[PDB]
Amino acid sequence: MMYKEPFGVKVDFETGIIEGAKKSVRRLSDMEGYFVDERAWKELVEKEDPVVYEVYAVEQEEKEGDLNFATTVLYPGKVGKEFFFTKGHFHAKLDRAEVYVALKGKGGMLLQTPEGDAKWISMEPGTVVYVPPYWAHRTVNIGDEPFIFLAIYPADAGHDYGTIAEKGFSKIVIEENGEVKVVDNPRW
Template sequence: MTETNVKPFNLDFDLVTGLSKSTKSTKRHLSKMKGMYADDAAFAAAVQSGDPLVYEFYELDLPETSGNLLFGTSIVYPGKVGNEYYMTKGHFHTILETGEVYYCLSGEGAMLLENPEGDWDLQRFIPGQAVYVPPRYAHRSINLGTEPLVTFFTFRADAGHDYGTIETKGYRKLVIEKDGKPEIIDNPKWK
C-alpha cells in the first residue's frame, strides 16, 4: 500500500449558514429596533417579555475595498410585533449607486425596496429565487412565514451601510398581517 498526501476536509463551517465559523456575526434583538415598528405598545411589551432575537447576519470578513465582493447569509426569524412581521432594520448603501443580490435559501418572505424619490416595490422571497436590489434603493427583508427566512446576499465591498436614514425617516410602507395574509399599508410614522 502506498502512502498518499491527502489532507482532511476542513469542517470549520456552520451547517446552517454554510459560512466559516470565523465569519463575522451580527445579532439584532428587538430592543435594537426601536422606532422601526408602528405599534409602540406591542413593541414595548415584546421587549419587556424577553427581547426576542429578530434577525442575524453573517458576513465574510474581507477588506472593504473596491474590487472585492462582500457576501453572507441573513436569517430573519418568524414572529410579529402587533400585526407587523419581523423584519431587518433595512439600509441604504453609503455609496448609493450600489446594487445588491439576495438569494432565498429557505423560508418565505419579502424584500421591501424604496428609493429617495419615493418609488417602492415589494418582491417575494421563495426558496431558489433571487431578488435584485437596484442602486439607490433601501432594502429590508421581512419574514412572512412560520420558519426562519434564510437568504444569501452579495454586494461591492466598499459600498458601506447607511442605517441612519432609515432610523430617522423609516420606510414609507409597512407589511402587516391582515386576515391571515400580508398587506402593504402606509407607515403612519414616516417622516
C-alpha cells in the same frame, strides 16, 4: 504584489451559519423606533426581547471591485400586526447594487428609493433578487419558520442606516384579516 487567498466555505442552507464569519445579532431592543406599534414593541422587549435576526458576514476591505457576502437568519414573528424585519439601509455608496439568494423559508424584500418609490419582491427558496443602485432594502419574514438568505454586495458599498432609522419605509408589511398586506406606512 500580494494576492489574497481564495477560499471555499460550506454553508448549510438550513442554518445560514458560516464558519469563520463575523456574527451579529439583532434583538428587538436593538430596534427602537422601527416598528409602528410602539406599545407592542415595548411589551415584547420586556417579556422576551426576542432575537429578530442574525447575520454571518464575510467581509473584505472597502475596495472597489471586491465582494462581501453575508447570510441572514431572519426569525419569524410580529410586533403587533407588523412582521419581523431587518433594520434596512441604503448603501453608504448609493449606487452600489446587491444580489440576494433566498435559501430557506417565506419572506420578501421591501425596497425604496431616496424619493420613497416603493417595491415589494416576494422571496422563496431559489428566488434571486436584484437590488439595483440607489434602492434601500429591508427583508421581511412573512412565515412561521426562519427566513434564510445569502447577500452578495460590493465590499465598498457600506451600510447607511440613519434616514431609515428615523423615517422608516413608505410601506409596511402586516397581517390583517388573515392576509399578508403591503400597505402605506401610517407614520410615514
